[PDB]
Amino acid sequence: NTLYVSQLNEKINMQRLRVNLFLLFATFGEVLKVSMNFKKQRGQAFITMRTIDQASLAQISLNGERFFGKPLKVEFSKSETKTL
Amino acid sequence: RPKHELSRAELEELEEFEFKHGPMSLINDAMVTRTPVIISLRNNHKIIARVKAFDRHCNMVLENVKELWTEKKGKNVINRERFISKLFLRGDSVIVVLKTP
Amino acid sequence: MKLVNFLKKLRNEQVTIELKNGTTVWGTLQSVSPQMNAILTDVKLTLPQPRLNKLNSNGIAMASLYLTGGQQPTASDNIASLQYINIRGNTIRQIILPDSLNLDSLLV
Amino acid sequence: KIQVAHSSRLANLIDYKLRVLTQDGRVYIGQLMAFDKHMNLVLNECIEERVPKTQLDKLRPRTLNIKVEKRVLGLTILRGEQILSTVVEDKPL
Amino acid sequence: GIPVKLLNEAQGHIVSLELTTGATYRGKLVESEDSMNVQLRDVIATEPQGAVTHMDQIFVRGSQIKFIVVPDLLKNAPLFK
Amino acid sequence: KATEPQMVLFNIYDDWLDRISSYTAFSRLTLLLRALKTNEESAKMILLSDPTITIKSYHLWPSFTDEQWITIESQMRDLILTEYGRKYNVNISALTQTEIKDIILG
Amino acid sequence: MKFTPSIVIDAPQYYVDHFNGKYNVDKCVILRDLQLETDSESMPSSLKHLTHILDLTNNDLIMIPDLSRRDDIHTLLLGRNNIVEVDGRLLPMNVQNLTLSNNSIRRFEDLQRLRRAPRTLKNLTLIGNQVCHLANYREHVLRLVPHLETLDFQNVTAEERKSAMSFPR
Amino acid sequence: MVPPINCIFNFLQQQTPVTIWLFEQIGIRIKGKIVGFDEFMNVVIDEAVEIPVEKGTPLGKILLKGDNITLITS
Amino acid sequence: PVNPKPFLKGLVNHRVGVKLKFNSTEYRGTLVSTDNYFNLQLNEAEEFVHGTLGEIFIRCNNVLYIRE
Amino acid sequence: VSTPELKKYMDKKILLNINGSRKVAGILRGYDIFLNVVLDDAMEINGEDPANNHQLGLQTVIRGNSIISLEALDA
RNA sequence: AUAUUUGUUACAAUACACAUUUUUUGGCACCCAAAAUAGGACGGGAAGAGACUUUUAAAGUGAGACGUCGCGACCCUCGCAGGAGUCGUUCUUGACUUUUUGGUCGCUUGAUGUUUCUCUCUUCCCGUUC
């Protein structure tokens, strides 16, 4: 379900970043969590989706996609999310 | 004598006395005798109203009451009159109530 | 005697609750609490226009009126229409009840 | 929008997102949880919306767009003295 | 009532206060009574016009309180069962 | 308010008879006497309709200049005109003075 | 099927989008893969329920139009929609974002539909549209957008906004 | 500890003159000799003068309501 | 050592002025009766702020002070 | 019903705001259930600290209704 | 071999109690002033000028004060875990303890609300109305 992003623009703000992420991930499926709880930034964001299929699709399509200068490294999460 | 000592009926006799003999007897005698009363609210708007009913808190039911309110801006005055057939009035707004002759 | 017990028998009647703000509420009346908390159903609540060379109305009542979410954008004058407003008792000033009902039956 | 039960008291409605009006012209929107005898109530996720003085002038009679400055304050407890009227915004999850 | 009992459940935690005078007192809640008058410890104060100061101890009258902001994790607290 | 049998004297005519001639005032009385039955509640609605009006202490009738009273008796007739009319089903235009008197007197 | 009132009523308005506002509606059985071929008709059934966000993603909609006055609505997600033109006067003061990815909007058709505004939206995504490819498309989009906070995830550069304003003058 | 109404009783029997501030809306302050009081902190003042806020006019023996009381100051 | 309530019991049917808290208006008249809350009834009152008023009822919350 | 708990405050110099405008500072003496607070050596604080400040009386009592916030400047 | 109904007890819950400084029988109200006709008004954006400010003729638009979240960065910073651990108990629950990114600086005018004082015209573009 969850997709752990990495290698993104740290210079952008938190809320804005979250919004951007939401915008990105709405095409694949219904995004349950807007932004990662830790909010460390610099790539580390967990895009929580309703469906696994949607998540998979996202992983497939947005692997190395141009988001704020740098290519985002998509990957599946190790542990399941608290909301899911 | 404080009110918390009295029993349930002694409060009823106390309220009967306060309405019959007391300040609010001005309103009570006004309700029975069908004498129109003048009421000034805090708002500053005065109603000429006949009192159908009244109560401890002074909230009262008036029928055919006429409301008189004036307003001024930079010393330019206008007098406005508003007629309502039925009124229930909450008693906290009133200040002075007089019984017309 | 508590005269609020009268209002309890006025249920399901068209009424205006005219508040301390000057805000007036036309609506169908539902159960009135012993503290005179008055709960209505289909209500059009507004503020009168003092004319007087367009003297400024209540500034707090306009904000409280737009903040009900019921004021529609295209209303020329200042009004709002909404369902289910619940009004605290101490806010009421006057209540204008309909002309049809008879008091002699209800005031007992 | 939303139709509230024709007879529904403050006890009947719980967890509905409400819209609360105070004496000062500000509004607290959020889920109601508890309330009390004197009607001071507890909102879960609440945002106070306010009307700008320039916005208030715009509201005076002549499509209007008001900029309503609002700030988010979670799990508050209001005071019955300040509350003026209450309206229903949404229905529970 | 539950609303006051939740305020008693918030003792020893950072809370926010809005007085009807317009000020804002945010700080740690030491005491609270059933009259809603509370006393707060090591509290940052915001005057109605925005000037912010700091005071170590404060006692406020409950009648003058407007809203109280309580830590969110008290939402699921057993009072609401 | 009387719990005992007694004789009490009051004047039905009050102001109107004092203002207007005696033949006409009985007629204005009879226009009223028919009417208050047809005015179940609007009587106090129409008689008090001008709130400036007050009832004199000795008198029973609302004391007034008598122009609205001519309007009051006319409105009241129309309430009698429709209530007599609706039961038999007559148009308001079909109503004539000979019918209007037959409504008044019958 | 076609976007009716019944469908709207049916739609799951329980799970609120917690990023901003409340009531993230998804029209029909599911707005994601609803297949609304015609324009978004029967918008009045929602009645401005609630930054109210509506997800229309994976649907057949040709035109971004036919809305009822929605005061709340702040977010539109329209991804995988065959949008061609989105000209309207209903949703003007309202709305803070618009996601238009993977649609059919023209570079000139998108520019024409808005007609320009002194202030509008705040977040906009036009990605995977034919128009974005078009030469000077970013400059044209910035000039059309008039006021804008974003353009396909990258903010119009302050200097770019100044140069675009000069082009407009 | 000195309860406040005890202190007021010490204003009654000690016959000390007191100045008393009213609410900020009224704009006058009263001063006189506090004689006796009730549970509601409404007090009778003998030989009281009302000063606007020293040409104020003398009042009398006057009962003053406790609702408008702000300060009672010697 | 007179307290307020016996002070009102001693001022019955005497000429008393009462200053309200608002306009600095005082009603000058013969007191009739008082309630527990110190509601006031007056006869032959006159409003000073100039007029003459037959009978008066004054609610307790609006009075500022009572004098003779 | 319940007495307010000032018990740690008494005998300590305390500032408290009377109404919207006012701020009085004095050594707290006693208090009651309505919060009526009697204190001694009262001083009315103003913008200019030494200048516009003027003492009130040897003993001053305050109606609890006009009390907004009470801060102790002290241990 | 043939879950429903009836009675009792408890809990939740609605209708009958309180006008005296801590919530519901009010410290209430007031700044004041601005459109009328028979191509025309009104709003928004951009430019010019007057009058304002600053320097010794040349530069932008009523002025001075709290905060609020933001545009840049010559900086810091590793990078995948509201939850976490323990014990009881059996395939995920309770009881007891540890405690939020942003930590900052400019703004060569972010962008924007309070509060005091004093006194706009011209041109173009876009919407509404007759």
PDB file of all heavy atoms in Angstrom, chain G residues 39-40 61-67 76 78 81-92 95 97-101 103-117 120-121 125-126 144, unseen atoms left out:
ATOM      1  N   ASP G  39     -20.535  16.059 -20.025  1.00  0.00           N
ATOM      2  CA  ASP G  39     -20.086  17.060 -19.044  1.00  0.00           C
ATOM      3  C   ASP G  39     -20.729  16.807 -17.679  1.00  0.00           C
ATOM      4  O   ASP G  39     -21.777  16.159 -17.588  1.00  0.00           O
ATOM      5  CB  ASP G  39     -20.424  18.472 -19.524  1.00  0.00           C
ATOM      6  N   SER G  40     -20.093  17.323 -16.628  1.00  0.00           N
ATOM      7  CA  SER G  40     -20.525  17.068 -15.247  1.00  0.00           C
ATOM      8  C   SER G  40     -21.878  17.720 -14.932  1.00  0.00           C
ATOM      9  O   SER G  40     -21.939  18.811 -14.355  1.00  0.00           O
ATOM     10  CB  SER G  40     -19.457  17.541 -14.253  1.00  0.00           C
ATOM     11  N   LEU G  61     -14.787  12.823 -18.902  1.00  0.00           N
ATOM     12  CA  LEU G  61     -15.305  14.206 -19.064  1.00  0.00           C
ATOM     13  C   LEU G  61     -14.505  14.936 -20.147  1.00  0.00           C
ATOM     14  O   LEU G  61     -13.261  14.843 -20.142  1.00  0.00           O
ATOM     15  CB  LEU G  61     -15.205  14.935 -17.719  1.00  0.00           C
ATOM     16  N   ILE G  62     -15.228  15.551 -21.094  1.00  0.00           N
ATOM     17  CA  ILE G  62     -14.638  16.348 -22.212  1.00  0.00           C
ATOM     18  C   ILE G  62     -14.398  17.804 -21.783  1.00  0.00           C
ATOM     19  O   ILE G  62     -13.335  18.348 -22.143  1.00  0.00           O
ATOM     20  CB  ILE G  62     -15.527  16.265 -23.470  1.00  0.00           C
ATOM     21  N   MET G  63     -15.357  18.412 -21.075  1.00  0.00           N
ATOM     22  CA  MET G  63     -15.285  19.866 -20.752  1.00  0.00           C
ATOM     23  C   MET G  63     -15.351  20.087 -19.236  1.00  0.00           C
ATOM     24  O   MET G  63     -16.219  19.474 -18.583  1.00  0.00           O
ATOM     25  CB  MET G  63     -16.430  20.630 -21.425  1.00  0.00           C
ATOM     26  N   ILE G  64     -14.471  20.957 -18.724  1.00  0.00           N
ATOM     27  CA  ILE G  64     -14.481  21.373 -17.290  1.00  0.00           C
ATOM     28  C   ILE G  64     -15.488  22.517 -17.154  1.00  0.00           C
ATOM     29  O   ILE G  64     -15.070  23.693 -17.170  1.00  0.00           O
ATOM     30  CB  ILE G  64     -13.070  21.791 -16.830  1.00  0.00           C
ATOM     31  N   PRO G  65     -16.779  22.164 -17.055  1.00  0.00           N
ATOM     32  CA  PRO G  65     -17.900  23.122 -17.027  1.00  0.00           C
ATOM     33  C   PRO G  65     -19.190  22.513 -16.449  1.00  0.00           C
ATOM     34  O   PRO G  65     -19.216  21.316 -16.224  1.00  0.00           O
ATOM     35  CB  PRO G  65     -18.103  23.473 -18.507  1.00  0.00           C
ATOM     36  N   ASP G  66     -20.235  23.335 -16.267  1.00  0.00           N
ATOM     37  CA  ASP G  66     -21.577  22.850 -15.834  1.00  0.00           C
ATOM     38  C   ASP G  66     -21.720  22.832 -14.303  1.00  0.00           C
ATOM     39  O   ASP G  66     -22.753  22.330 -13.818  1.00  0.00           O
ATOM     40  CB  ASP G  66     -21.891  21.478 -16.439  1.00  0.00           C
ATOM     41  N   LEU G  67     -20.730  23.358 -13.578  1.00  0.00           N
ATOM     42  CA  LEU G  67     -20.748  23.450 -12.087  1.00  0.00           C
ATOM     43  C   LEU G  67     -21.896  24.336 -11.567  1.00  0.00           C
ATOM     44  O   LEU G  67     -22.266  25.303 -12.265  1.00  0.00           O
ATOM     45  CB  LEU G  67     -19.391  23.978 -11.607  1.00  0.00           C
ATOM     46  N   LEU G  76      -9.706  20.522  -7.136  1.00  0.00           N
ATOM     47  CA  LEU G  76     -10.228  19.652  -8.217  1.00  0.00           C
ATOM     48  C   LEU G  76      -9.085  18.749  -8.689  1.00  0.00           C
ATOM     49  O   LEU G  76      -8.051  19.283  -9.141  1.00  0.00           O
ATOM     50  CB  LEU G  76     -10.744  20.531  -9.360  1.00  0.00           C
ATOM     51  N   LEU G  78      -8.614  16.093 -11.582  1.00  0.00           N
ATOM     52  CA  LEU G  78      -9.300  15.732 -12.867  1.00  0.00           C
ATOM     53  C   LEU G  78      -8.490  14.776 -13.776  1.00  0.00           C
ATOM     54  O   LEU G  78      -8.801  14.716 -14.981  1.00  0.00           O
ATOM     55  CB  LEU G  78      -9.655  17.022 -13.616  1.00  0.00           C
ATOM     56  N   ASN G  81      -8.752  12.576 -17.571  1.00  0.00           N
ATOM     57  CA  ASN G  81     -10.024  13.113 -18.140  1.00  0.00           C
ATOM     58  C   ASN G  81      -9.755  13.692 -19.540  1.00  0.00           C
ATOM     59  O   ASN G  81      -8.719  14.366 -19.700  1.00  0.00           O
ATOM     60  CB  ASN G  81     -10.664  14.153 -17.216  1.00  0.00           C
ATOM     61  N   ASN G  82     -10.626  13.386 -20.506  1.00  0.00           N
ATOM     62  CA  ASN G  82     -10.401  13.877 -21.888  1.00  0.00           C
ATOM     63  C   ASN G  82     -10.913  15.315 -21.938  1.00  0.00           C
ATOM     64  O   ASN G  82     -11.823  15.604 -22.739  1.00  0.00           O
ATOM     65  CB  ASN G  82     -11.090  12.991 -22.928  1.00  0.00           C
ATOM     66  N   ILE G  83     -10.326  16.173 -21.098  1.00  0.00           N
ATOM     67  CA  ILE G  83     -10.699  17.614 -21.064  1.00  0.00           C
ATOM     68  C   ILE G  83     -10.228  18.243 -22.377  1.00  0.00           C
ATOM     69  O   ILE G  83      -9.081  17.973 -22.786  1.00  0.00           O
ATOM     70  CB  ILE G  83     -10.078  18.313 -19.838  1.00  0.00           C
ATOM     71  N   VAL G  84     -11.086  19.052 -22.994  1.00  0.00           N
ATOM     72  CA  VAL G  84     -10.709  19.799 -24.234  1.00  0.00           C
ATOM     73  C   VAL G  84     -10.663  21.305 -23.934  1.00  0.00           C
ATOM     74  O   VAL G  84      -9.628  21.933 -24.230  1.00  0.00           O
ATOM     75  CB  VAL G  84     -11.673  19.487 -25.395  1.00  0.00           C
ATOM     76  N   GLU G  85     -11.762  21.837 -23.392  1.00  0.00           N
ATOM     77  CA  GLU G  85     -11.851  23.253 -22.950  1.00  0.00           C
ATOM     78  C   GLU G  85     -12.514  23.296 -21.568  1.00  0.00           C
ATOM     79  O   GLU G  85     -13.384  22.442 -21.305  1.00  0.00           O
ATOM     80  CB  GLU G  85     -12.641  24.082 -23.965  1.00  0.00           C
ATOM     81  N   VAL G  86     -12.115  24.256 -20.730  1.00  0.00           N
ATOM     82  CA  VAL G  86     -12.684  24.419 -19.388  1.00  0.00           C
ATOM     83  C   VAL G  86     -13.022  25.884 -19.101  1.00  0.00           C
ATOM     84  O   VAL G  86     -12.481  26.490 -18.171  1.00  0.00           O
ATOM     85  CB  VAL G  86     -11.719  23.888 -18.308  1.00  0.00           C
ATOM     86  N   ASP G  87     -13.925  26.436 -19.910  1.00  0.00           N
ATOM     87  CA  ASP G  87     -14.420  27.805 -19.734  1.00  0.00           C
ATOM     88  C   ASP G  87     -15.680  27.805 -18.871  1.00  0.00           C
ATOM     89  O   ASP G  87     -16.561  26.960 -19.052  1.00  0.00           O
ATOM     90  CB  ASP G  87     -14.726  28.438 -21.092  1.00  0.00           C
ATOM     91  N   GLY G  88     -15.693  28.686 -17.866  1.00  0.00           N
ATOM     92  CA  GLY G  88     -16.836  28.802 -16.940  1.00  0.00           C
ATOM     93  C   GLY G  88     -16.854  30.139 -16.218  1.00  0.00           C
ATOM     94  O   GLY G  88     -15.798  30.799 -16.167  1.00  0.00           O
ATOM     95  N   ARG G  89     -18.014  30.510 -15.668  1.00  0.00           N
ATOM     96  CA  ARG G  89     -18.135  31.650 -14.752  1.00  0.00           C
ATOM     97  C   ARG G  89     -18.615  31.278 -13.339  1.00  0.00           C
ATOM     98  O   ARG G  89     -18.710  32.155 -12.476  1.00  0.00           O
ATOM     99  CB  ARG G  89     -19.091  32.686 -15.346  1.00  0.00           C
ATOM    100  N   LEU G  90     -18.907  29.996 -13.097  1.00  0.00           N
ATOM    101  CA  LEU G  90     -19.416  29.543 -11.799  1.00  0.00           C
ATOM    102  C   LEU G  90     -18.297  29.463 -10.760  1.00  0.00           C
ATOM    103  O   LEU G  90     -18.330  30.172  -9.750  1.00  0.00           O
ATOM    104  CB  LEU G  90     -20.106  28.183 -11.932  1.00  0.00           C
ATOM    105  N   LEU G  91     -17.312  28.603 -11.022  1.00  0.00           N
ATOM    106  CA  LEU G  91     -16.159  28.431 -10.134  1.00  0.00           C
ATOM    107  C   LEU G  91     -15.093  29.477 -10.459  1.00  0.00           C
ATOM    108  O   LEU G  91     -14.133  29.197 -11.181  1.00  0.00           O
ATOM    109  CB  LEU G  91     -15.582  27.018 -10.272  1.00  0.00           C
ATOM    110  N   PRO G  92     -15.283  30.699  -9.949  1.00  0.00           N
ATOM    111  CA  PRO G  92     -14.296  31.764 -10.174  1.00  0.00           C
ATOM    112  C   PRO G  92     -13.624  32.238  -8.875  1.00  0.00           C
ATOM    113  O   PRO G  92     -12.422  32.081  -8.753  1.00  0.00           O
ATOM    114  CB  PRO G  92     -15.134  32.902 -10.772  1.00  0.00           C
ATOM    115  N   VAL G  95     -12.047  27.990  -5.207  1.00  0.00           N
ATOM    116  CA  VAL G  95     -11.036  27.059  -5.800  1.00  0.00           C
ATOM    117  C   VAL G  95      -9.612  27.556  -5.508  1.00  0.00           C
ATOM    118  O   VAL G  95      -9.363  28.766  -5.679  1.00  0.00           O
ATOM    119  CB  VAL G  95     -11.264  26.872  -7.314  1.00  0.00           C
ATOM    120  N   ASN G  97      -6.772  25.103  -6.257  1.00  0.00           N
ATOM    121  CA  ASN G  97      -5.882  24.169  -6.998  1.00  0.00           C
ATOM    122  C   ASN G  97      -6.653  23.513  -8.149  1.00  0.00           C
ATOM    123  O   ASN G  97      -7.895  23.439  -8.064  1.00  0.00           O
ATOM    124  CB  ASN G  97      -5.262  23.120  -6.072  1.00  0.00           C
ATOM    125  N   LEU G  98      -5.929  23.055  -9.174  1.00  0.00           N
ATOM    126  CA  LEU G  98      -6.537  22.360 -10.314  1.00  0.00           C
ATOM    127  C   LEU G  98      -5.545  21.401 -10.934  1.00  0.00           C
ATOM    128  O   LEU G  98      -4.564  21.846 -11.495  1.00  0.00           O
ATOM    129  CB  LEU G  98      -7.069  23.363 -11.326  1.00  0.00           C
ATOM    130  N   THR G  99      -5.801  20.087 -10.824  1.00  0.00           N
ATOM    131  CA  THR G  99      -4.880  19.076 -11.374  1.00  0.00           C
ATOM    132  C   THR G  99      -5.478  18.500 -12.630  1.00  0.00           C
ATOM    133  O   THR G  99      -6.493  17.812 -12.572  1.00  0.00           O
ATOM    134  CB  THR G  99      -4.572  18.048 -10.295  1.00  0.00           C
ATOM    135  N   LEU G 100      -4.839  18.776 -13.776  1.00  0.00           N
ATOM    136  CA  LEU G 100      -5.395  18.435 -15.119  1.00  0.00           C
ATOM    137  C   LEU G 100      -4.532  17.401 -15.866  1.00  0.00           C
ATOM    138  O   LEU G 100      -4.642  17.349 -17.106  1.00  0.00           O
ATOM    139  CB  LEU G 100      -5.533  19.723 -15.936  1.00  0.00           C
ATOM    140  N   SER G 101      -3.788  16.552 -15.153  1.00  0.00           N
ATOM    141  CA  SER G 101      -2.801  15.649 -15.809  1.00  0.00           C
ATOM    142  C   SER G 101      -3.487  14.652 -16.756  1.00  0.00           C
ATOM    143  O   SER G 101      -4.635  14.257 -16.478  1.00  0.00           O
ATOM    144  CB  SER G 101      -1.961  14.937 -14.780  1.00  0.00           C
ATOM    145  N   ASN G 103      -4.762  14.726 -19.923  1.00  0.00           N
ATOM    146  CA  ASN G 103      -6.028  15.108 -20.537  1.00  0.00           C
ATOM    147  C   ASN G 103      -5.734  15.497 -21.990  1.00  0.00           C
ATOM    148  O   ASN G 103      -4.618  15.240 -22.467  1.00  0.00           O
ATOM    149  CB  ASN G 103      -6.606  16.267 -19.734  1.00  0.00           C
ATOM    150  N   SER G 104      -6.739  16.048 -22.681  1.00  0.00           N
ATOM    151  CA  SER G 104      -6.629  16.383 -24.126  1.00  0.00           C
ATOM    152  C   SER G 104      -6.594  17.901 -24.348  1.00  0.00           C
ATOM    153  O   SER G 104      -6.762  18.324 -25.509  1.00  0.00           O
ATOM    154  CB  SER G 104      -7.745  15.741 -24.913  1.00  0.00           C
ATOM    155  N   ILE G 105      -6.402  18.689 -23.284  1.00  0.00           N
ATOM    156  CA  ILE G 105      -6.542  20.174 -23.385  1.00  0.00           C
ATOM    157  C   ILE G 105      -5.508  20.724 -24.376  1.00  0.00           C
ATOM    158  O   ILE G 105      -4.334  20.310 -24.303  1.00  0.00           O
ATOM    159  CB  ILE G 105      -6.408  20.831 -21.997  1.00  0.00           C
ATOM    160  N   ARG G 106      -5.948  21.626 -25.262  1.00  0.00           N
ATOM    161  CA  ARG G 106      -5.072  22.287 -26.269  1.00  0.00           C
ATOM    162  C   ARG G 106      -4.275  23.418 -25.608  1.00  0.00           C
ATOM    163  O   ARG G 106      -4.769  23.985 -24.612  1.00  0.00           O
ATOM    164  CB  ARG G 106      -5.909  22.817 -27.438  1.00  0.00           C
ATOM    165  N   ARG G 107      -3.094  23.734 -26.152  1.00  0.00           N
ATOM    166  CA  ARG G 107      -2.267  24.868 -25.655  1.00  0.00           C
ATOM    167  C   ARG G 107      -3.025  26.185 -25.870  1.00  0.00           C
ATOM    168  O   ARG G 107      -3.000  27.036 -24.959  1.00  0.00           O
ATOM    169  CB  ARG G 107      -0.911  24.893 -26.368  1.00  0.00           C
ATOM    170  N   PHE G 108      -3.675  26.335 -27.030  1.00  0.00           N
ATOM    171  CA  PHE G 108      -4.510  27.525 -27.332  1.00  0.00           C
ATOM    172  C   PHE G 108      -5.895  27.348 -26.699  1.00  0.00           C
ATOM    173  O   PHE G 108      -6.433  28.340 -26.176  1.00  0.00           O
ATOM    174  CB  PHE G 108      -4.612  27.736 -28.845  1.00  0.00           C
ATOM    175  N   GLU G 109      -6.452  26.132 -26.744  1.00  0.00           N
ATOM    176  CA  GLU G 109      -7.796  25.880 -26.154  1.00  0.00           C
ATOM    177  C   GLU G 109      -7.761  26.121 -24.638  1.00  0.00           C
ATOM    178  O   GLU G 109      -8.673  26.825 -24.126  1.00  0.00           O
ATOM    179  CB  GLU G 109      -8.254  24.453 -26.468  1.00  0.00           C
ATOM    180  N   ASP G 110      -6.724  25.625 -23.953  1.00  0.00           N
ATOM    181  CA  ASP G 110      -6.627  25.887 -22.488  1.00  0.00           C
ATOM    182  C   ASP G 110      -6.515  27.401 -22.236  1.00  0.00           C
ATOM    183  O   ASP G 110      -7.151  27.914 -21.259  1.00  0.00           O
ATOM    184  CB  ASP G 110      -5.457  25.122 -21.863  1.00  0.00           C
ATOM    185  N   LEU G 111      -5.674  28.087 -23.017  1.00  0.00           N
ATOM    186  CA  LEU G 111      -5.450  29.544 -22.822  1.00  0.00           C
ATOM    187  C   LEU G 111      -6.750  30.309 -23.095  1.00  0.00           C
ATOM    188  O   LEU G 111      -7.063  31.239 -22.324  1.00  0.00           O
ATOM    189  CB  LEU G 111      -4.333  30.005 -23.764  1.00  0.00           C
ATOM    190  N   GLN G 112      -7.466  29.928 -24.157  1.00  0.00           N
ATOM    191  CA  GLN G 112      -8.709  30.629 -24.579  1.00  0.00           C
ATOM    192  C   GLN G 112      -9.794  30.491 -23.506  1.00  0.00           C
ATOM    193  O   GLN G 112     -10.507  31.483 -23.259  1.00  0.00           O
ATOM    194  CB  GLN G 112      -9.197  30.081 -25.922  1.00  0.00           C
ATOM    195  N   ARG G 113      -9.921  29.301 -22.911  1.00  0.00           N
ATOM    196  CA  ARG G 113     -11.069  28.984 -22.019  1.00  0.00           C
ATOM    197  C   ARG G 113     -11.068  29.900 -20.789  1.00  0.00           C
ATOM    198  O   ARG G 113     -12.156  30.384 -20.421  1.00  0.00           O
ATOM    199  CB  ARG G 113     -11.027  27.510 -21.601  1.00  0.00           C
ATOM    200  N   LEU G 114      -9.898  30.122 -20.179  1.00  0.00           N
ATOM    201  CA  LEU G 114      -9.825  30.956 -18.948  1.00  0.00           C
ATOM    202  C   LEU G 114     -10.243  32.395 -19.275  1.00  0.00           C
ATOM    203  O   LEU G 114     -11.009  32.984 -18.485  1.00  0.00           O
ATOM    204  CB  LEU G 114      -8.396  30.909 -18.400  1.00  0.00           C
ATOM    205  N   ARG G 115      -9.683  32.957 -20.351  1.00  0.00           N
ATOM    206  CA  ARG G 115      -9.988  34.348 -20.782  1.00  0.00           C
ATOM    207  C   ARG G 115      -9.163  35.321 -19.932  1.00  0.00           C
ATOM    208  O   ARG G 115      -9.295  36.545 -20.137  1.00  0.00           O
ATOM    209  CB  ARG G 115     -11.487  34.633 -20.645  1.00  0.00           C
ATOM    210  N   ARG G 116      -8.352  34.779 -19.016  1.00  0.00           N
ATOM    211  CA  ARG G 116      -7.455  35.577 -18.134  1.00  0.00           C
ATOM    212  C   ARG G 116      -8.213  35.960 -16.857  1.00  0.00           C
ATOM    213  O   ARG G 116      -9.457  36.031 -16.909  1.00  0.00           O
ATOM    214  CB  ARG G 116      -6.924  36.813 -18.867  1.00  0.00           C
ATOM    215  N   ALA G 117      -7.484  36.205 -15.763  1.00  0.00           N
ATOM    216  CA  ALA G 117      -8.090  36.707 -14.506  1.00  0.00           C
ATOM    217  C   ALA G 117      -7.077  37.589 -13.769  1.00  0.00           C
ATOM    218  O   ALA G 117      -5.864  37.337 -13.913  1.00  0.00           O
ATOM    219  CB  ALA G 117      -8.537  35.546 -13.652  1.00  0.00           C
ATOM    220  N   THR G 120      -6.427  34.119  -9.735  1.00  0.00           N
ATOM    221  CA  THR G 120      -7.148  32.829  -9.918  1.00  0.00           C
ATOM    222  C   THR G 120      -6.400  31.691  -9.212  1.00  0.00           C
ATOM    223  O   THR G 120      -5.182  31.837  -8.982  1.00  0.00           O
ATOM    224  CB  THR G 120      -7.356  32.519 -11.407  1.00  0.00           C
ATOM    225  N   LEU G 121      -7.108  30.601  -8.902  1.00  0.00           N
ATOM    226  CA  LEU G 121      -6.479  29.348  -8.403  1.00  0.00           C
ATOM    227  C   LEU G 121      -5.311  29.671  -7.465  1.00  0.00           C
ATOM    228  O   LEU G 121      -5.492  30.498  -6.549  1.00  0.00           O
ATOM    229  CB  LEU G 121      -6.007  28.518  -9.601  1.00  0.00           C
ATOM    230  N   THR G 125      -1.804  22.081 -12.441  1.00  0.00           N
ATOM    231  CA  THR G 125      -0.952  21.078 -13.130  1.00  0.00           C
ATOM    232  C   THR G 125      -1.570  20.798 -14.499  1.00  0.00           C
ATOM    233  O   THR G 125      -2.772  20.469 -14.532  1.00  0.00           O
ATOM    234  CB  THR G 125      -0.817  19.798 -12.294  1.00  0.00           C
ATOM    235  N   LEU G 126      -0.797  21.012 -15.571  1.00  0.00           N
ATOM    236  CA  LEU G 126      -1.255  20.819 -16.975  1.00  0.00           C
ATOM    237  C   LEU G 126      -0.463  19.681 -17.633  1.00  0.00           C
ATOM    238  O   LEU G 126      -0.451  19.614 -18.878  1.00  0.00           O
ATOM    239  CB  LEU G 126      -1.072  22.132 -17.743  1.00  0.00           C
ATOM    240  N   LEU G 144      -1.159  33.411 -19.813  1.00  0.00           N
ATOM    241  CA  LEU G 144      -2.604  33.086 -19.685  1.00  0.00           C
ATOM    242  C   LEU G 144      -3.001  32.999 -18.204  1.00  0.00           C
ATOM    243  O   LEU G 144      -4.062  33.547 -17.849  1.00  0.00           O
ATOM    244  CB  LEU G 144      -2.881  31.763 -20.407  1.00  0.00           C
TER     245      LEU G 144
END
